[PDB]
Write a protein that binds this DNA or RNA. Structure first.
Length: 256
DNA sequence: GCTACGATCG
DNA sequence: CGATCGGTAGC
């Protein structure tokens, strides 16, 4: 079985002190896509680049302790693409792609717009520039899994307080509509929602109040999958036995 | 300190 | 409903 994990680690150095390194192996994952390294290559230990002898490819931001994504895999990729090919966003290290024969897996960290209006605008620009990339990849006809933190909840079921967040970055009408377009217009499959139509499956919880304790969370981490491979998905779960971050790892198993 | 990233309650 | 009520990671 092909096990792919998507985990926003909220600082790889921090997560490695919480037991995330051991989790990489114990999970039995074949491919692990991580987001928010919050570190540059020089700050990464050998074990943070190639954990447990796994191959690894990362894209770090130009600013220190910020963003950054990576893809670890037991198998050696026959091709690697660091960045979207758009400087505006590659400055922030938000996109990595690895090709494994007929398969391709991406680690994505989509920009947040909650800090300020200017960052919301930047986020919308990212949607504009990434949408055509999703359409192209979809047209490749090959098996593709885009894991990562998309920073958008799609429907009411995807967050605890949908009524009160309709004017907040992450659940704005325009954003929800964008996700909807990716799924239906482009034809991508929200793997979790298709596997478990009724299960909320939150993957993130705010630091405010007692959000985590009360399970006041959002589902903003995805594995968007192409049709053929999506139909081969057998199960998935949000790992919460341990906590290495304010995000929880999203695990999906495929009958390849 | 800084940067950067909405649950609670009146 | 609108007003106010931010913990964390790394610099």
């Amino acid at each position: 079985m092909l096990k792919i994990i998507s985990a926003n680690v909220n600082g790889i150095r921090s997560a490695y002190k919480k037991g995330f390194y051991e989790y990489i192996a114990a999970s039995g994952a074949d491919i692990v896509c991580v987001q928010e390294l919050k570190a540059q290559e020089a700050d990464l230990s050998a074990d943070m680049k190639n954990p447990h002898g796994m191959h690894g490819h990362w894209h770090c931001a130009e600013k220190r302790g910020y963003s950054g994504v990576a893809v670890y895999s037991k198998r050696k990729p026959d091709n690697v693409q660091i960045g979207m090919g758009i400087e505006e966003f590659d400055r922030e290290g938000r996109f990595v792609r690895c090709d494994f024969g007929r398969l391709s897996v991406i680690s994505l960290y989509l920009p947040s717009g909650s800090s300020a209006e200017e960052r919301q605008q930047v986020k919308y620009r990212f949607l504009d520039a990434f949408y055509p990339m999703l359409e192209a990849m979809k047209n490749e006809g090959r098996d593709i899994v885009v894991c990562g933190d998309w920073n958008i909840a799609h429907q009411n079921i995807d967050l605890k307080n949908w009524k009160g967040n309709q004017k907040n970055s992450g659940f704005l009408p325009e954003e929800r509509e964008w996700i909807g377009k990716v799924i239906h217009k482009l034809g991508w499959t929200d793997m979790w929602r298709t596997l478990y139509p009724d299960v909320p499956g939150y993957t993130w919880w705010s630091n405010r109040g007692q959000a985590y304790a009360k399970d006041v969370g959002w589902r903003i981490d995805y594995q968007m999958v192409t049709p053929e491979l999506a139909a081969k998905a057998v199960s998935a779960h949000v790992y919460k036995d341990e906590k290495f971050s304010d995000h929880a790892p999203l695990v999906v198993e495929y009958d390849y």
